[PDB]
């Protein structure tokens, strides 16, 4: 029984640790090719299954209506490179590492999505993944500028038709269609390249895709989104799921809930790999590790933290003085109008303590509220990973980076070898495709 | 006074020579990263200014409305990779070569175009170019599933506002906005990052762009489109122009006309570089060159040739038997209703002879009618490039490949050194950016 | 049953074709890393078993005790880079291709040879080869400050002990000696690293080697030397043999002779792979190919060919006039005292005739007298290779380059795919080491 | 006025910190190409002047003529790859970084040293350096099967002629000798390529060298050897000096003495750059750094230090009891029969206390006695480098690695940017050669 490992970070200034760009070890090379090439090569040296990128299309002015926080202090999406370009860059200099990009079904037509990932899948020789998200934000809306705003759960309904359209397109070409018979002049068998002719309620695409199928057949479908409608969506489509849980109990529930949704949709639950995100901080001794973590968490500015907390909760908390205690917010707006997730974050993060908005945002900024921080030696981290795996937390772990590129160098040089020595993580790539690393079947046309 | 050199080929089976995939030397590696990496490194080894890719978003299927000729025999766009992914791949393995991609203003929002190229421009450290095109044909639309028919000249009017929007977005970040002051916690100066708030007749985008400016400020604007409206457009926006002319008389006229449009738009004509395309075929002796050219041209299948000729002429010629002579086509449609390009191509390619459709399509397939074929020794090709340059044909030449990747290995190894010894082509890159190679000024925010 | 392919060229101006540096396509980049990196990456792209380099440690100056000819016209070894440095350079940018260097047993101590190749073998993860040679020439000696005389056959007797010393050194480290037990503080098992204490008639070396064994155990032994003593030496030590024969029948005879020597030495003949050198000249048509061979052969200066002919035959022909007829030299030297190779060359070149030594030197300069020039289409060349292989000419072919880097780009693009489609050449590397490519066993400690 | 930076480490298990291979972060990849490619790319990313490697031609078995200590516990030179091969590997994947290798004048002929470094200088396009050393040890002489023992100072006398011989060889080719006139058939001007025919007291070399001059003319001469005879030697030949001093006071004296010896040799002291070695240990806080230093030092086994200390003293400490008080040991020899370096070191223990032999060996294993360990934050390390530089300690610093590859990643990511912000270290390479980086003149032929 071996676990999977994945890397994850924004093509930009911040991922989960909101003080990361301030870290003494941060190169902040996120505008340069070299930065991404170093990181991709490092994770491949550590035999990672994959690396994938989140995405948002707007700087967030969202809290509360301003960039002065985001841009001035380095909040979420202050810098955000288009993710598919970035992984093409990474694909060019690796040969085994799987690579994923987050693209919303909202903003692009299925033809575009299908061709972009089929192209990347071929260029990388069958190593690509699309992380499917159904987001719609007005600012993103403001940027791409389209306002018909569809309700959260209906976006997933549309996304069902979207995925079907994309997969029809990826099946345009039989895997034996291309002939390249030079002598005879037969380029391809036109009876094995078929029109798509899709017309559903939401979308219309004609086809065929002008891009044949790679050696893994189709890109791997990644999925992120844990809403009840999102888990149903994952049951039907996800081949790997991006999850975040603060502790083993929540990890195990999410795991079993997702595997249940998959089985309920008629699919094999062992063909959907669940990853849970964890943020390790290493030290030669546990003491050093805990001091490094303390240093890391002290870089978070209370307002950048609050900004993200405002965005994730849907409540704008900039409207209040920063010293407002959380119970004066519930007092001021009534418990019915303060999101549950926000009341559950205040209770868990404060431990019963009535915290100011400053301190709540500061703590939220350390780890986005729910990504577990693990401080310890390489041996301790290896142990924790192995025991969570054995307790059924996940099929693999996403390693959320405290600072870049350095943390991945530390994790690969110190933690990966220990995992290999215990026999719970690959010593070498067995196959060449992302499907093979993940133990997924090669889909048929 | 030095000339410029550019590479050009589709990320796919065919560019201008319709027998290229059948050439004994063709690797047909156009689905692999390696193919593109080899070519990009080769052109950088030869100190080329740039390489750019065309694009079409559908298998050309009009003649007449079928997969079978295009796919079966390997016509235009039978395989067509998404071009921006492809040059991202090339950028990761080069450090000087300029890289361009053709993207239509029709099918994407200005926000997308701006973010993709800003990303590539940053990933490549200031080496990227967008080749602006305004196309819109029904099959591509059928894929993007849209009902629109903006008339040709109106597409250019919309493109004016489009470019304006993209350039506003690329000016979101001043070049001194990014601070990365870790000690003070100041990421960036928010007074140097500006909202865009563009609301024009055609488009609306708010901004700012989440991507700072590269060391060359903004991507270089390439343009392709030689219609009277397109030349006006080039006058206003183009920093480099993609042109194709069958002989020196037409090259010089196109040259002077473009430079005139640029001056008429209030811009400096020497800040718009005109490239003209030529298809060289080398041999150790002139005799060897001519036999290789004859071999190359003998690979063109008459029906693939005819397919492209139909698409370009706007006339479906599948309806006729292949042995139909061209004058029964003129009889069948009336001299008035025969597109001018089609009448000029028939007269030029036949030299007055009445040709079958097979033979007309076959000759069109050799060079898309109007790309000059130059057979000779390295010294002769070098001579011809120099004399055309001295005769005011162009500021630079696009080298259309008879077959890939080999032809570029030959060109870089045999012709480039001769140009360098004569002092008309750079022996080494003087700058690091595409603007520096082309001698373009660094634009202000 | 598949054939093997090897590349072979001098790290310098000339290999077998003496007009190569003058070829219009020759880059003459033999002083730069880029030149060697390109060729290695190209031969790896073509799935070649290996690439190796010859060596001489002095500008040939025997004819006529001066460098005016060698240096002035670009003769053998006019430029000659140190070969182990070069293949280290190639190893760094490849991961499958085997890489070999010729080093003479005469000029270096066994410890030095062992350490250099053990190092390269580790650096390349098991892809290195030593081409064993026993040369001793005075100019080389003059350079090394040696005033050593040892007779041809005795040099080989000495080499037997040399090989034995080197192979002991490569067994210094057991393959399980290295522990890297950090926690316990045990670097390596001291009972599995052993002193050598070699004290023989010729050499003494103590050991152990400071370099452990790579994944292929030991560097592959290549050998070049076709003399009667040379074949015995190959019989005992060679794992691969570099041979040259002018036609299939002699190829076949040398082939069986070497396999017989291997069997006579008590070894398995299928564990010594025989390569024979061939010089292909490709053309799209046979006519083009023959014109290209004619062009290439016309670049040879009669005196450079003659210079080389002198060095291989042992007679310095410089003293004679260029119009000295060949039977007038044997008249004044007797059937008894002019070398055997020298007139199996003259007759073969005339096939009957009396030529001036100018003409004899010119013809020798094209292909070093005995390397067959094969001009044809890719299909014909592929046919001939398969046909010679099936006829028992060799286990593999050394592809002698008419000019560099260009000829290898053509061969990999045109001939290799044809071999692969016929199933007689690997479509992909099955293993990672040079031993696995050659189908050699992993030697024991 | 900027300081220079150099990297330095053995191609093997240990450099100065003898517990390094045991460090949790050490990859111990010293047998793989990847390990060296990574370190070299990292130092190039950090704009280092140079990286050079030490060497020994035998496993360190002196204490006590057995390998059980050296091999069993991982003392210095237990694994030691041939250094010229290693830097060739590094040169292939870098384009600016300087690269040097240590080769003894004792064991190789001048022709061999000359050709290897001329070859490397060309492969690297002028970035190479030879670190001149005059060592002669018994284990090493018995691997090369040498039995002549030359007195310490005489080896340096021999070395004087050695360098003249090597520099003569490097002037074999005029920098305008190579012509490559393909049309005229003139390879090179033979009157600009000269025989050497060097015959002095010690050595004889004929020439010419088969390798032309690189872009920087000749390899840079590094030297290491601080005996009085070594410093006179450095005065005459060295262009950069490797020095080690435990504090600013000794640094400054060593600095000024070397500059004087150079002036005394009639050379410009500004044209010989002196480097001093320091071993930094970084932490996010000073507390963290001091702890990481403690961890590092706690990995040192007392006997490996002594194994290594035996050779440096050159006294064999192997059979004195480990708890032998040092002074008591002092007595059999007589204060007069004690090598001094060891003696100051006893002094440099710094407690001036009678110390166990275990304990002297432990401390020596820590930092080779005299390389200062600096623990602190990046700012503190930068400060100390700047303040030492300004106080005239050295023209540049050698950064001795606590553990590899990681410490260089930390150093380049944390300290270099700070040095750059202060303007005391280059933000970018101004030239392409090692001579340009060090501010050395281009020597003429
Ligand atoms: C762990 C995780 C990571 C996510 N990352 C992104 C992301 O990078 N970009 C995005 O648009 N949506 C992302 N989402 C999904 C958003 O929640 C999104 O707004 C979607 O509409 C709702 O997903 P949901 O099922 O959580 O409601 C992520 C969701 C999860 C659970
Ligand atoms: C040399 C040249 C190359 C062109 N390449 C493309 C291309 O690759 N893709 C595309 O959509 N349009 C391309 N075009 C422009 C097409 O003509 C396009 O349909 C546009 O609507 C009309 O441009 P026009 O000004 O030539 O009419 C190119 C035009 C020229 C002159
Ligand atoms: C095909 C072939 C290639 C050879 N290449 C070299 C070489 O590059 N350098 C060298 O010193 N000897 C080379 N030799 C060996 C020389 O002939 C050498 O001087 C040796 O002492 C005699 O080899 P022999 O067995 O052919 O007589 C080669 C031999 C053969 C058959
Ligand atoms: C900082 C430094 C580093 C040295 N490194 C080496 C080395 O790696 N290999 C070597 O043989 N000698 C090295 N030496 C010099 C040795 O002492 C050498 O054996 C020589 O014979 C005597 O040099 P000396 O002048 O210091 O006595 C080094 C010397 C110094 C000062």
Numbering used by the authors:
A (entry chain B), B (entry chain A), C (entry chain C), D (entry chain D): 5 to 449
Direct quotes from the study:
Then, DBT sulfone monooxygenase DszA catalyzes the oxidation of DBT sulfone into 2′-hydroxybiphenyl 2-sulfonic acid (HBPSi). BdsA is a DBT sulfone monooxygenase that shares a 79% sequence identity with DszA from Rhodococcus sp. IGTS8. The BdsA monomer contains nine β-strands (β1–β9) and 13 α-helices (α1–α13), which fold into a triosephosphate isomerase (TIM)-barrel with five extended insertion regions. The TIM-barrel structure confirms that BdsA belongs to the group C flavin-dependent monooxygenases.
The structure of the tetrameric BdsA–FMN complex contains four FMN molecules, with each subunit binding one FMN. The binding pocket is mainly formed by IS1, IS2, IS3, and IS5. The overall Cα RMSD between apo-BdsA and the BdsA-FMN complex is only 0.240 Å. The most substantial structural discriminations were observed at the side chains of residues Phe56, Val137, and Phe246, which may facilitate the binding of FMN. The binding of FMN to BdsA is maintained through hydrogen bonds and hydrophobic interactions. The flavin ring of FMN lies in the barrel, with its plane nearly parallel with the staves of the barrel, and its si-face exposed to the solvent. There are several hydrogen bonding interactions between BdsA and FMN: the NE2 atom of His 156 with the O3 atom of the flavin phosphate groups (2.7 Å); the OG atom of Ser139 with the N1 atom of the flavin ring (2.8 Å); backbone nitrogen of Leu230 with the phosphate group (3.1 Å); and the Arg159 with the O4 atom of the flavin ring (3.4 Å). Two residues, Tyr160 and Val137, form van der Waals contacts with FMN. Based on the structural analysis, six single-point mutations of BdsA were constructed: V137A, S139A, H156A, R159A, Y160A, and L230A. The results of enzymatic activity showed that mutant proteins V137A, S139A, R159A, Y160A, and L230A completely lost their activity.
